[PDB]
TrEMBL record, chain A:
Organism expressing this protein natively: Influenza A virus (A/little yellow-shouldered bat/Guatemala/060/2010(H17N10))
Enzyme class: transferase
Lineage of origin: Viruses, Riboviria, Orthornavirae, Negarnaviricota, Polyploviricotina
UniProt: Mg(2+) 1 binding residues: 304-305, 446, 491
Catalytic activity: RNA(n) + a ribonucleoside 5'-triphosphate = RNA(n+1) + diphosphate
InterPro entries, A to Z: RNA-dir_pol_NSvirus, RNA_pol_PB1_influenza
Name of the protein in its database record: RNA-directed RNA polymerase catalytic subunit
Residue intervals passing through the bilayer: none
UniProt signal peptide: none
Described purpose of this protein according to its UniProt entry: RNA-dependent RNA polymerase which is responsible for replication and transcription of virus RNA segments. The transcription of viral mRNAs occurs by a unique mechanism called cap-snatching. 5' methylated caps of cellular mRNAs are cleaved after 10-13 nucleotides by PA. In turn, these short capped RNAs are used as primers by PB1 for transcription of viral mRNAs. During virus replication, PB1 initiates RNA synthesis and copy vRNA into complementary RNA (cRNA) which in turn serves as a template for the production of more vRNAs.
Predominant cellular place of this UniProt entry's protein: host cell
Automatic annotation (TrEMBL), chain B:
Domain Influenza RNA polymerase PB2 middle: 109-250
Chain ranges of the Polymerase basic protein 2 helical domain: 253-321
Purpose of the protein: Plays an essential role in transcription initiation and cap-stealing mechanism, in which cellular capped pre-mRNAs are used to generate primers for viral transcription.
Protein name per the record: Polymerase basic protein 2
Gene name of the record: PB2
Chain ranges of the Influenza RNA polymerase PB2 second domain: 39-107
Lineage: Viruses, Riboviria, Orthornavirae, Negarnaviricota, Polyploviricotina
Origin: domain of life: Viruses
Record GO terms (molecular function): RNA binding
Alphabetical list of InterPro entries matching this protein: Flu_PB2_2nd (IPR049110), Flu_PB2_6th (IPR049114), Flu_PB2_C (IPR049115), Flu_PB2_CAP-bd (IPR048298), Flu_PB2_middle (IPR049111), Flu_PB2_N (IPR049106), PB2_helical (IPR049113), PDB2_C (IPR037258)
UniProtKB/TrEMBL annotation, chain C:
Oligomer status and interactors: Influenza RNA polymerase is composed of three subunits: PB1, PB2 and PA.
GO molecular function, one term: metal ion binding
The protein's name: Polymerase acidic protein
One GO process term, biological-process aspect: viral RNA genome replication
Organism for this UniProt entry: Influenza A virus (A/little yellow-shouldered bat/Guatemala/060/2010(H17N10))
Stated family: Belongs to the influenza viruses PA family.
Keyword Ion transport belongs to the record: no
Entry keyword set: Eukaryotic host gene expression shutoff by virus, Host gene expression shutoff by virus, Host-virus interaction, Metal-binding
Top-level taxon of the source organism: Viruses
Length: 745, 740, 482
RNA sequence: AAAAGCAGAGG
RNA sequence: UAUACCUCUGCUUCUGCU
RNA sequence: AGUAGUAACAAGAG
């Protein structure tokens, strides 16, 4: 008998057994190599869908920019980027007219948040294109290098600690003709490896001074570094993602904050809510949309997705939307909120790392960069890369490629949600006054669209009307990945509604494992993951008990901390058995110390050091929760082998070893400033205790804050009986000598 | 004493690079240079922990451990090695050093774990002394609500608790921020009294106070109790198909117990009005009911909560009534006049559509609580007079603001400035009166400026307040007089003995009608503590959707006997008490005409032979449980009230409420399956439909031989033998025949 | 934009646009849609990291030697119970590979197993082992600036995978994987005391689940893959240069309660200096087997099979003597594949959740726990297979083992073809579901949907089997309306 | 009715 | 020259290694 | 060779 699991769907409905259709127990698809081909394919598709637009050369950058807005109306069912701006403005105007007072309150919220916001809000990003280094750096170091290059020129407004002064300096920086940066460079030499007896190359990374020209800095400030996306499920082919830099992220933050304030107060946006709040909002607006319909009306639902969404939007459409939303607002508000579509319309896309080129008479491989792909003769590339370089060659501006149309992968998620919500809003029956009307939800590009009509032909006309109205604004519904059915069952952002949102346990299956922090945090994470999946994702009681057993097995085999009655032989077996045999109450030992599992379905919310506190030996809990714990960090005793505070952490809260080494690469030239910065933060925190708890606020230099703090604390210690007058004179003389060293260096 | 850190700073200021960083980087830019990295970062720490435990030393620790842990074990294992390049304050540590510290380390008699993690020990004490009841299996109906995972201080909000935490732990590090409340000052004094000479680090003290005082809320799918001691064990008490009875270890909170008392009493009253004897059903339901495993009839004896549904339960028991309610922190002792509630649609001042319940009728009030007192005459959407008194200047204005919001005119509703949402971020219906109250209690200028002025006769016993605040005895507001003594207290704490009758209307010993069952709010909120109506009049879990699914489940699983009652002697079938909590979701006007429509459909299905559809009996049978009317109309749906929103149940076919899937052969009610009727459906399902229209038989699809199409209410111009087409619903076109 | 007044612009450009821009709803009916187009070509090859249905274990019962737990000691104790070692002779050649290298690799392996004095075994860097592990098959990576004068510097080629054909062995592997055994392969850990009533109910249901799921053959493949990936990860990260020998060893308990150590073969680790997460550590797998490769040779394209022994095999009527082969091949893995292979035990979480929901969805309707009626009243409720008679229905334990084996093979045969196929065929399953709900479904481009589904069915045996399964389910749905 | 980091998922 | 943006959920409060 | 799959690993920047 040939076994077929999908015949299970002959009895169980597909949404009830949907977790079988998610093969999420194997490895996800990774890429191997460069994302240069995916970047080239994104650029080629982006200029393919907008090819009938206006070609014009930018006077500042020189890039061949393509202008598809107000272009010819589409003639086929393909992707099209030709968006009509009067249609976009009519949609934003009708969105305002249906929701009165919304735009003014959102704009006033954003005006009040503009003056509050500091520069460090930009340090909450992951990996940023450092235009100073032409690489990816973390966003804090990218902002730090940007602010250092800015203040090394005559651009010091960001010293006032506000985001908007940094944005004033950003827009003023394009006027500088000869912006000067500090870059990295390697010094290679050949030395012999000793453990393998091979001659290899030793790269030492250093610093270097180089000056950018005006047009080169304008290219690097508009550059979106492109990489390939790893571990994406559900796709056969890979795709490219892009990261912008510090010149653009502040403006995109303010535009997305304004659009977030808009999207929070729209019934038809799935953003920014998420999880159970999203499911509650979706079921409530489904109930409201089915309350708006009558008995005679049909009701269908489009389980929709839009094809090639981010390359078929436009920054010019977003400029029109920003200027129509902020109508009646101040002019500095309109200019500051309109910077970001202008920075996205003149943008430029760095291709990748290049390609690997293979020789056979020399038996060699090498990496020729993406900025060197225009030097190689075309007979060396394979046919697809040859076609891509032929289709892309006229767009190259200093290794990057001109990319005037399209968003390039999701930097305007809420503004795109507003643009889709306007087309959802146009289908009101008092606006349309037709034989059909529609309403729906929209996250960014996904939409559920409930269309009502008196007959099925009116549903067809409503589908056509919605599809053409989306075509007029640059939104192309995927005819492959979308489908329609009667209302009561749909899918929206992998939430499978079947008269109510069913669960999907498999999607949260990669959370079920040992997290890998230390022995205590992993135990809390594993028990809490089982707990929250029992709460939210309909994990059964028996399966949760089996998940406790599987996590205890994985935890013991990971940390080599099996019990004392087991005979497995690890590095820790003799020490754990010595702790096991000498302990009277073995039920109070932690799982990381050979103890038994205390956990069942009722005590998942109680930590393990708490669940076993009554069963511990007094010597064992005096050793485990010892105040002078050497595995954790101790504070220093402030102004109340020096004095420390007592550590409340256990011995299983240790720090795992980190490795930052790069193969054959010495990095003592660029890892030094990080060490000096951490030394400066550590000497600051001895004067200000709360700086670890809540990040401090100020505009004066750290030396002046620390010297004023030392002076006033010496005076309060003098006039409260906690210091002598000789100590007070010593501290004030020291602060005066430091003040003599802050100027007379 | 503070002399070592200044010498550290003088040593770090002589290095010129460090001096440049200390002099050029401000305190706001030190947030940026704190997260500055340069080297390669490592993804996927799970796999790195999977392989790094194979190494001898996967743990890094401070260099002091060279003096607190020996280099070798008894068994010869090396416990640590120094790192290669010297100068670093780190060494590499084996996990055998951890096990050696746990078996032969120094033993300290003081441990800060039970104090810092007091919350988890309180959860453990709640679980250990917790009682477990049986496990029941039925269809859960969970609602994703915002609940407290941390209850916080009752006197503090999260912002005020963070103010208190920054005042207790870091008193020199608050900025230009002062404490506002007396609660914040008292909790700061108490927490400074406890945490003085504390050896715990200030950050750990801050997080201990943060898990004590700060309220945290999450959106969770809740069935039943939403208190913070029933949400902590939410994985244990509820599942997808089962309910685990549980009572924690301790006392129930009073501010939770009063609320679930109100909700329990509202459900008992609203179920009681539908019954044959509302008084006997209320007395049968009130004794078996237990809130948090404590009986209801002995909580009502001692609870001082005064509310129009709690009072009917108390007047049926024999407990003295304080005939009042609460609104905005003030008790409203209504003296004269009886109003009645009606749902209306009100356009607001922010052009916002809003649907409320306004009370039509004349009333007179005696408002008073905790700082002030006022006597109020008020009709339908009108604030006549308000002789407001009190004990300060601000408190009489606060009571004036509260009474102007309570008036519910057309003037305060068109006086809103700014935004005021009446749905939440998850589009859940916020209460409109408290929304307007919290609006007009912070920004109150445009209400007073639109309130205007009125000329009053300058006689004593009445003063006046201007629309700014300067007291004049000639010009006042439009109703706002200042009482020079207020109203007399010591008669608002006085409780009243009361009579009650069969239909739950409360009278005093004089005879003035205090409470009616119509005054009881038909708001469906869910409780903080679990309520167990141990009755044959209420299902297991209450709420509207649970009533729907439990009623349809009971009809489906008893269909073999209910079908036999339907076929012969049906007048005993409709009056069954299991259909009686279903009627609480139909609004009161439609119940008689829905039952008349349903009984006419069932009689036509009996008389027209062969037209049997059991799904059409199951779907409409809980609507026939009301003494009908005779009004010959034509319904295309039956509207029910669920969570403050209507839901339409179509007479023909499937809907969002009641679907019948031929795939699973299962009837789905509100996303939950309630079973197959008897798997006896193949003998049914003919062509002609009988229980859709009142007097007409559906004969297949439409026809062009029989004239143009119609709508539902265009059939009175038809005769016995005239056949026509009807656009019945859901895009269908059917042929329609009249009977003789 | 500040002074824009809408003058009916959208209706104007709706009239001005062409009527070749539309979304025509075409009605969906599964009695009219075609089946998925499986590719054509050569048959599909086994690509797993170990033999599944054909592997043979030398087993010892209740080990009590000097190294009861140490890997190579248990390997030596299991090899000592086989005395049929004859000379190695190749009986099935690897076509693209030097087969005498595989012969000399097994000879060097067995001889160093003989002279093994220690707990570990590192093989010697010989020429045939350096071929079988690929030491030297990389071109030396240079910097472009130092090799600007190379004439033959062409590129790396980016051919797609070649379209293979559905061979019948992968259905046989899934058949043998969903069957019970005479052992217990998962040996769980302890819980706390079941104090709450729901913990008694959960423990009763978990005992049923453990009885049905610990003796399945997919649990044996779970333990083999978890052990192999664990030992390979530890050896790859701690023995980077050395050619470490890793024996495939699992530990089971029989249903009579006695322990057993099974040896399935050996894995010679290669050089492993992995820096990425997709960098491939090469190894050589040598697994004992009894199945002749010359009967289903298309399955064994990458294998060199050399007959290495004899064993007296007992049978149901009498007792015979069979030869013993050794499937040798070069294989490779990465840190991501070893990471996701060490975590194969969550396949138990993927199946046992679903079956539990199948009980719970009944338990809410029956107003009772339906665990014991599902596991004892064997009424054959769920359809899980296709026989020549009709469609075969199994019980909830059979469904539990089938869903276990499906998750296990999703983890063994993980590929981007599987991800794309499942994501694109989920939509077709939802359209068929919407049809069976009488919810009147309809697409706009069904040809593009079929083209996107069939784009992923290329060469993977599991994905080809899943497409065949989809076609069988579609034919069952079409027969259900007859 | 009333701070940041890491991990996982989704888009 | 290499893991983007946004959102939700969960945990933790980190001192910095050829 | 093998892993693999639109470009790589098969040690010498992750
Ligand atoms: O990882 C992600 C996924 C999605 N997105 C954003 O979400 C949008 C829709 O995500 P998508 O998955 O639909 N991809 P799309 O670009 O529409 O092409 P297609 O597969 O043909 O539908 C994308 O266009 C991005 O803007 C991201 O930014 N990052
Ligand atoms: Mg898309
Ligand atoms: Mg979608
Ligand atoms: Mg999408």
């Amino acid at each position: 008998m040939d076994v077929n699991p999908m015949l299970i769907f002959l009895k169980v409905p597909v949404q009830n057994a949907i977790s079988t259709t998610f093969p999420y127990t194997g490895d996800p698809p990774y890429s191997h190599g460069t994302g240069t081909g995916y970047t080239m394919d994104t650029v080629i598709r982006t200029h393919d869908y907008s090819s009938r637009g206006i070609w014009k050369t930018n006077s500042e950058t020189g890039a061949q920019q393509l202008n598809p807005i107000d272009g010819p109306l589409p003639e086929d069912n393909e992707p099209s980027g030709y968006a009509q701006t009067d249609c976009v403005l009519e949609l934003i105007e009708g969105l305002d007219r249906s929701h009165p007072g919304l735009f003014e309150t959102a704009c006033q919220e954003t005006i009040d948040a503009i003056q509050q916001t500091r520069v460090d809000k930009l340090t909450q990003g992951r990996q940023t294109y450092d235009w100073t280094l032409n690489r990816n750096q973390p966003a804090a170091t990218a902002l730090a290098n940007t602010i250092e290059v800015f203040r090394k020129n005559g651009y010091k407004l960001n010293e006032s600690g506000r985001l908007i002064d940094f944005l004033k300096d950003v827009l003023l920086s394009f006027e500088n003709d000869s912006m000067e940066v500090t870059t990295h460079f390697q010094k290679k030499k050949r030395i012999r490896d000793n453990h393998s007896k091979k001659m290899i190359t030793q790269r030492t990374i250093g610093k270097k001074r180089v000056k950018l020209t005006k047009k080169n800095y304008l290219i690097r400030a508009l550059t979106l570094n492109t990489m390939t996306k790893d571990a994406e499920r559900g796709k056969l082919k890979r795709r490219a993602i892009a990261t912008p830099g510090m010149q653009i992220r502040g403006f995109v933050y303010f535009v997305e904050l304004l659009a977030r304030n808009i999207c929070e107060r729209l019934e038809q946006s799935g953003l920014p809510v998420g999880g159970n709040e999203k499911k509650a909002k979706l079921a409530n607006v489904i109930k409201k949309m089915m309350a708006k319909s009558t008995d005679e009306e049909l009701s269908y639902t489009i389980t929709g997705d839009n094809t090639k969404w981010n390359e078929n939007q436009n920054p010019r459409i977003f400029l029109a939307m920003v200027l129509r939303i902020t109508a009646g607002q101040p002019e500095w508000f309109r200019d500051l909120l309109a910077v970001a579509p202008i920075m996205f319309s003149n943008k430029v896309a760095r291709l990748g790392r290049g390609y690997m080129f293979e020789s056979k008479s020399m038996h060699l491989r090498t990496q020729i960069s993406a900025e060197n792909l225009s030097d190689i003769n075309l007979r060396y590339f394979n046919e697809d890369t040859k076609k891509k370089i032929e289709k892309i060659r006229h767009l190259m501006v200093e290794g990057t490629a001109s990319l005037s149309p399209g968003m390039m992968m999701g930097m305007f998620n809420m503004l795109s949600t507003v643009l889709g919500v306007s087309v959802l809003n146009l289908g009101q029956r008092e606006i349309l006054k037709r034989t059909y009307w529609w309403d729906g939800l929209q996250s960014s590009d996904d939409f559920a669209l409930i269309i009502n009509g008196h007959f099925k032909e009116d549903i067809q006309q409503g589908v056509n009307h919605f599809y053409r109205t989306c075509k007029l604004v640059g939104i192309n519904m995927s005819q492959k990945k979308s489908y329609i059915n009667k209302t009561g069952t749909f899918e929206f952002t992998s939430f499978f509604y079947r008269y109510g949102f069913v669960a999907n346990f498999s999607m949260e299956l990669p959370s079920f494992g040992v997290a890998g922090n230390n022995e205590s945090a992993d135990m809390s994470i594993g028990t809490t993951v089982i707990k929250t999946n029992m709460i939210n994702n309909d994990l059964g009681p028996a399966t949760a008990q089996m998940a406790i057993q599987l996590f205890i097995k994985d935890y013991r085999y990971t940390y080599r901390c099996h019990r004392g009655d087991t005979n497995l032989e690890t590095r820790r077996t003799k020490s754990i058995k010595r702790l096991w045999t000498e302990t009277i109450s073995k039920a109070g030992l932690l799982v990381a110390d050979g103890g038994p599992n205390p956990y069942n379905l009722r005590n998942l919310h109680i930590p393990e050091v708490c669940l076993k506190w009554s069963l511990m030996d007094p010597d064992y809990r005096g050793r485990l929760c010892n105040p002078n714990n050497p595995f954790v960090h101790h504070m220093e005793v402030e102004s109340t082998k020096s004095l420390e505070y007592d550590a409340v952490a256990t011995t299983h809260s240790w720090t795992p070893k980190r490795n930052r080494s790069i193969l054959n690469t010495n990095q003592r030239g660029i890892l030094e400033d990080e060490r000096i910065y951490q030394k400066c933060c550590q000497v600051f925190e001895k004067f200000f205790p709360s700086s670890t708890y809540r990040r401090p606020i100020g505009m004066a230099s750290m030396l002046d804050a620390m010297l004023s703090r030392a002076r006033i604390d010496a005076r309060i210690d003098l006039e409260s009986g906690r210091i002598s007058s000789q100590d007070f004179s010593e501290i004030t003389n020291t602060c005066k000598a430091i003040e003599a060293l802050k100027r007379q260096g | 004493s503070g002399m070592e850190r200044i010498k550290e700073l003088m040593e770090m200021v002589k290095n010129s690079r460090m001096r440049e960083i200390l002099t050029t980087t401000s305190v706001d830019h030190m947030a940026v240079i704190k997260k500055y990295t340069s080297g390669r970062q490592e993804k996927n720490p799970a796999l790195r922990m999977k392989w790094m435990m194979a190494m001898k030393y996967p743990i890094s620790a401070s260099s002091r451990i060279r003096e607190m842990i020996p280099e070798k074990d008894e068994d010869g294992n090396t416990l640590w090695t120094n790192t290669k390049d010297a100068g670093s304050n780190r060494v590499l540590v084996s996990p055998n050093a951890v096990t050696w510290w746990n078996r032969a380390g120094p033993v300290s008699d003081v441990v800060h774990y039970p104090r810092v993690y007091k919350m988890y020990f309180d959860r453990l004490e709640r679980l250990t002394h917790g009682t477990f009841g049986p496990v029941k299996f039925y269809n859960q109906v969970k609602v994703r609500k915002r609940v407290d995972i941390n209850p916080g201080h009752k006197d503090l909000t999260s912002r005020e608790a963070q103010e208190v935490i920054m005042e207790v732990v870091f008193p020199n590090e608050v900025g230009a921020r002062t404490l506002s409340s007396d609660a914040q000052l008292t909790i700061t004094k108490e927490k400074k009294e406890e945490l003085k000479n504390c050896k715990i680090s200030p950050i750990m003290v801050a997080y201990m106070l943060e898990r004590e005082l700060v309220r945290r809320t999450r959106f969770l799918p809740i069935a039943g109790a939403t208190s913070s001691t029933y949400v902590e064990v939410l994985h244990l008490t509820q599942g997808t198909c089962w309910e685990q009875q549980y009572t924690p270890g301790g006392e129930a909170e009073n501010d939770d117990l009063d609320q679930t008392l109100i909700i329990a009493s509202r459900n008992i009253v609203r179920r009681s009005i539908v019954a044959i004897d509302p008084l006997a059903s209320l007395l049968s339901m009130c004794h078996t009911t237990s809130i948090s495993s404590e009986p209801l009839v002995e909580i009502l004896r001692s609870n001082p909560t005064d509310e129009q549904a709690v009072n009917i339960c108390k007047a049926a028991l024999g407990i003295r009534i304080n005939n009042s309610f609460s609104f905005g922190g003030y008790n409203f002792k209504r003296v004269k006049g009886s109003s009645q509630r009606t749902e209306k649609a009100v356009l607001t001042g922010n052009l916002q559509t809003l649907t409320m319940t306004i009370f039509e009728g004349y009333e007179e009030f005696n408002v008073s609580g905790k700082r002030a007192s006022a006597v109020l005459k008020k009709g339908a959407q009108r604030l006549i007079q308000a002789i407001i008194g009190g004990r300060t200047l601000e408190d009489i204005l606060n009571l004036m603001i509260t009474l102007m919001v309570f008036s519910q005119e057309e003037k305060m509703l068109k006086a809103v400035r700014g935004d005021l949402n009446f749905v939440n971020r998850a589009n859940q219906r916020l209460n409109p009166m408290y929304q307007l109250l919290r609006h007009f209690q912070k920004d109150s200028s445009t209400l007073l400026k639109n309130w205007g002025t009125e000329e009053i006769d300058p006689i004593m016993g009445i003063a006046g307040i201007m629309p700014d605040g300067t007291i004049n005895k000639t010009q006042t507001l439009m109703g706002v007089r200042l009482s020079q003594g207020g109203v007399d207290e010591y008669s608002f704490n006085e409780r009243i003995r009361v009579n009650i009758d069969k239909y739950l209307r409360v009278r005093n010993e004089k005879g003035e009608l205090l409470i009616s069952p119509e005054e009881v709010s038909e708001a469906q909120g869910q409780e903080k503590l679990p309520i167990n109506y141990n009755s044959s009049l209420m299902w297991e879990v209450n709420g509207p959707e649970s009533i729907l699914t439990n009623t349809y489940h009971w009809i489906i699983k008893n269909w073999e006997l209910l079908k036999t009652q339907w076929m012969t002697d049906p007048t005993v079938l409709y009056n069954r008490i299991e259909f009686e909590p279903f009627q609480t979701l139909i609004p009161k006007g439609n119940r008689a005409i829905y039952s008349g429509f349903t009984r006419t459909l069932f009689q036509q299905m009996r008389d027209v032979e062969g037209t049997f559809d059991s799904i059409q009996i199951i779907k409409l049978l809980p609507f026939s449980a009301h003494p009908p009317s005779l009004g010959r109309t034509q319904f295309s749906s039956f509207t029910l009230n669920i969570r403050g929103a209507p839901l339409r149940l179509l007479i023909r076919g499937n809907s969002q409420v009641f679907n019948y899937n031929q795939m699973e052969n299962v009837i789905i009610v509100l996303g939950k399956s309630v079973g197959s009727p008897e798997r006896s459906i193949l003998t049914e399902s003919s062509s002609i439909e009988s229980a859709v229209l009142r007097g007409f038989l559906i004969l297949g699809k439409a026809n062009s031989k029989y004239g143009p199409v119609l709508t539902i209410g265009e059939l009175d111009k038809l005769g016995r033998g005239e056949k026509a087409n009807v656009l019945i619903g859901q895009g269908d076109t059917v042929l329609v025949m009249k009977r003789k | 934009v500040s002074s824009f007044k809408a003058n009916g612009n959208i209706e104007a450009k709706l009239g001005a646009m062409s009527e070749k821009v539309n979304a025509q709803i075409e009605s969906f009916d599964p009695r009219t849609i075609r089946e998925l187009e499986l590719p054509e070509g050569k048959f599909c090859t086994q690509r797993s990291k170990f033999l599944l249905m054909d592997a043979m274990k030398l087993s010892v019962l209740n080990p009590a030697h000097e190294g009861e737990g140490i890997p190579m000691k248990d390997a030596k104790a299991c090899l000592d119970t086989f005395w049929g070692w004859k000379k190695a002779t190749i009986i099935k050649k690897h076509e693209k590979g030097v087969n005498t290298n595989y012969l000399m690799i097994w000879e060097q392996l067995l001889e160093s197993i003989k002279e093994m004095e220690g707990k570990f075994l590192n093989l010697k860097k010989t020429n045939h082992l350096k071929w079988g592990l690929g030491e030297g098959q990389a071109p030396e990576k240079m910097d472009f600036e130092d090799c600007k004068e190379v004439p033959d510097l062409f590129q790396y080629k980016s051919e797609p995978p070649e379209k293979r054909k559905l061979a019948s062995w992968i259905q046989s592997e899934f058949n043998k994987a969903s069957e019970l055994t005479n052992s217990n392969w998962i040996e769980f850990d302890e819980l706390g005391n079941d104090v709450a009533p729901i913990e008694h109910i959960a423990s009763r249901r978990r005992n049923f689940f453990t009885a049905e799921v610990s003796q399945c053959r997919a649990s044996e493949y779970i333990m083999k893959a978890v052990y192999i990936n664990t030992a390979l990860l530890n050896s790859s990260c701690t023995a980077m240069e050395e050619y470490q020998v890793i024996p495939i060893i699992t530990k089971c308990r029989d249903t009579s309660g006695q322990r057993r150590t099974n040896l399935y073969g050996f894995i010679i680790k290669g050089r492993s200096h992995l820096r990425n997460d997709t960098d491939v550590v090469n190894f050589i797998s040598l697994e004992f087997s009894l199945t002749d490769p010359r009967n289903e040779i298309h399955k064994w394209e990458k294998y060199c099979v050399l007959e290495i022994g004899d064993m007296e095999i007992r049978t149901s009527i009498s007792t015979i003597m069979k030869p013993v082969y050794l499937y040798v091949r070069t294989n490779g893995t990465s840190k991501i594949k070893m990471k996701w292979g060490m975590e194969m035990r969550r396949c138990l979480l993927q199946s046992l959740q679903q079956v539990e929901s199948m009980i719970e969805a009944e338990s809410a309707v029956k107003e009772k726990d339906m665990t014991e009626p599902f596991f004892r009243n064997r009424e054959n409720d769920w359809p899980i297979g296709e026989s020549p008679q009709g469609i075969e229905k199994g019980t909830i334990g059979k469904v539990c083992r089938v869903l276990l084996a499906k998750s296990v093979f999703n983890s063994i045969y993980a590929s981007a073809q599987l991800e794309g196929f499942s994501a694109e065929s989920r939509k077709l399953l939802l359209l068929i579901q919407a049809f069976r709900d009488n919810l009147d479904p309809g697409t706009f481009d069904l040809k593009g949907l079929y083209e996107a589904i069939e784009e992923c069915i290329i060469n993977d045996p599991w994905v080809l089997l899943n497409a065949s399964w989809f076609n069988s389910f579609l034919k069952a749905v079409q027969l259900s309306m007859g």
